[PDB]
């Protein structure tokens, strides 16, 4: 399929978005409604994810988290805003998006000329620190700069699943926005949290991994 939505554990689902370069995002089906983690690539891909969601639950999509300011994590925002979902980010992600959206859209289109020239659509719910959703069951946090200066992790304590965002994945990638030296220091800050983790969802390549994905990528970036 162009996109799949598949349960990993309980209310926690993984989105495989095979449009453009494959990106993986997440969905949490809660009591009051649905939280989307990563907006997906475009308003069209977001509509496709919403179609999959409505085959699972009739509850509202409450909010979507932009886990960084990039096109693969924020490109769907126009759609999510249009259906009345909140678009949620840290203040840092929001500020970088205002200043740098046009640059990341241009960068995206160098590699993917087919990708649309999307207008800026900023988050409307902005957090100055770490934050939670779903009665504390979706837990977003900053552990430092890595793939971008602002990228966050999201943790699901009940299911022991960590969303790795663009930060954790199988292949190095080309590192154009990364802070190569801070990257492993960020991953070691994350490990020092000692979060119970059964599953890491890589944000690119095949999503389903163990906690060793952290180590895998750490080893790669340290040889970069
Ligand atoms: Zn990415």
68 Cα to the center of ligand 1, angstroms: 9
35 has which bridge partners? 28, 63
Domains, in order of start, for the chain: 1-224 (3.60.15.10)
Q: What are phi and psi of 45, to 5 degrees?
A: -70, -35
Residue 1's Cβ-count burial label (10 Å; 0-12, 13-18, 19+) is exposed
Helices then strands, counting H and E runs in the chain, come out as 6, 13
220 Cβ neighbours under 8 A, 6+ residues apart: 171, 172
Question: Ligand 1 center to residue 51 CA distance, Å?
Answer: 23
Q: What are the distances in angstroms from CA 25 to CA 4, 100, 151, 153, 154?
A: 10, 22, 14, 12, 11
Dist. CA 62 → ligand 1 center (Å): 23
- Cβ atoms 138, 32 nearer than 8 A: no
Cα separation, 95 vs 57, in Å, equals 33
Ramachandran class of 144: left when φ > 0, alpha when ψ lies in -120 to 50, beta otherwise: left
* Closest to 210 in 3D by CA, of 221, 219, 202: 202
Contact between 211 and 178 under an 8 Å Cβ cutoff? The reply is no
Return d(Cα 99, Cα 111) in angstroms, integer. 21
The method recorded for this entry reads X-ray
Q: How far apart are the first and last CA of the chain?
A: 34
Q: Is 220 helix (H, G, I), strand (E, B) or coil?
A: helix
What stretch of H or E contains 208?
A: strand 208-209
Residue 176: both structure tokens together: 């154009």
Q: With H, G, I as helix, E, B as strand and everything else as coil, classify residue 52.
A: helix
* Pairwise CA distance, residues 20 & 2, whole Å: 10
- What pairing do the DSSP bridges indicate for beta strands 12-17 and 86-90? unpaired
Tell me how far apart the alpha carbons of residues 133 and 35 are, in angstroms, rounded to a whole number: 8
C-alpha 193 to ligand 1 mean position (Å)? 24
**Euclidean distance between CA atoms 52 and 91, whole angstroms:** 30
**198 CA → ligand 1 middle, Å:** 22
H or E, element range at 141: strand 138-141
Largest pairwise CA distance in the chain = 47
**What is the three-class DSSP state of 140?**
strand
Q: How far is the CA of 204 from the centre of ligand 1 (A)?
A: 6
Q: Burial, 168: exposed, middle or buried (Cβ in 10 Å; 0-12, 13-18, 19+)?
A: buried
> Which phi and psi angles does 109 have, rounded to 5°?
-80, -15
Asked if residue 81 belongs to a known ligand binding site, the reply is: no
State the Cα–Cα distance between residues 104 and 110, nearest whole angstrom: 10
User: Is residue 176 packed enough to be buried (19+ CB in 10 Å), middle (13-18) or exposed (0-12)?
Assistant: exposed
Taking the centre of ligand 1 as the mean of its atom positions, its distance from the CA of residue 109, in whole angstroms, is: 14
Helix (H) or strand (E) holding 7: strand 3-9
Is 198 labelled as part of a ligand binding site?
A: no
The neighbourhood of ligand 1, an ion, using CB within 5 A, equals: 72, 166
């Amino acid at each position: 399929a162009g996109m799949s939505l598949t349960q990993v554990s309980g209310p926690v689902y993984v989105v495989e978005d095979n449009y453009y370069v494959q990106e993986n995002s997440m969905v949490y089906f809660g009591a009051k409604g649905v939280t989307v983690v990563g907006a997906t690539w475009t308003p069209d891909t977001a509509r496709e994810l919403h179609k999959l969601i409505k085959r699972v639950s009739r509850k509202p999509v409450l909010e979507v988290i932009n886990t960084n300011y990039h096109t693969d994590r924020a490109g769907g925002n126009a759609y999510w805003k249009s259906i009345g979902a909140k678009v949620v980010s840290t203040r840092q992600t929001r500020d970088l998006m205002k200043s740098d959206w046009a640059e990341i859209v241009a960068f995206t289109r160098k590699g993917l000329p087919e990708y649309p020239d999307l207008p800026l659509v900023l988050p409307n719910v902005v957090h100055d620190g770490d934050f939670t959703l779903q009665e504390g069951k979706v837990r977003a946090f900053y552990a430092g700069p890595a793939h971008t200066p602002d990228g966050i992790f999201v943790y699901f304590p009940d299911e022991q699943v960590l969303y790795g965002n663009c930060i954790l994945k199988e292949k190095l990638g080309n590192l154009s926005f990364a802070d190569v030296k801070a990257y492993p220091q960020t991953l070691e800050r994350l490990k020092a949290m000692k979060l119970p983790i059964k599953t890491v969802i890589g944000g690119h390549d095949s999503p389903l991994h163990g906690p060793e994905l952290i180590d895998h990528y750490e080893a790669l970036i340290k040889a970069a």
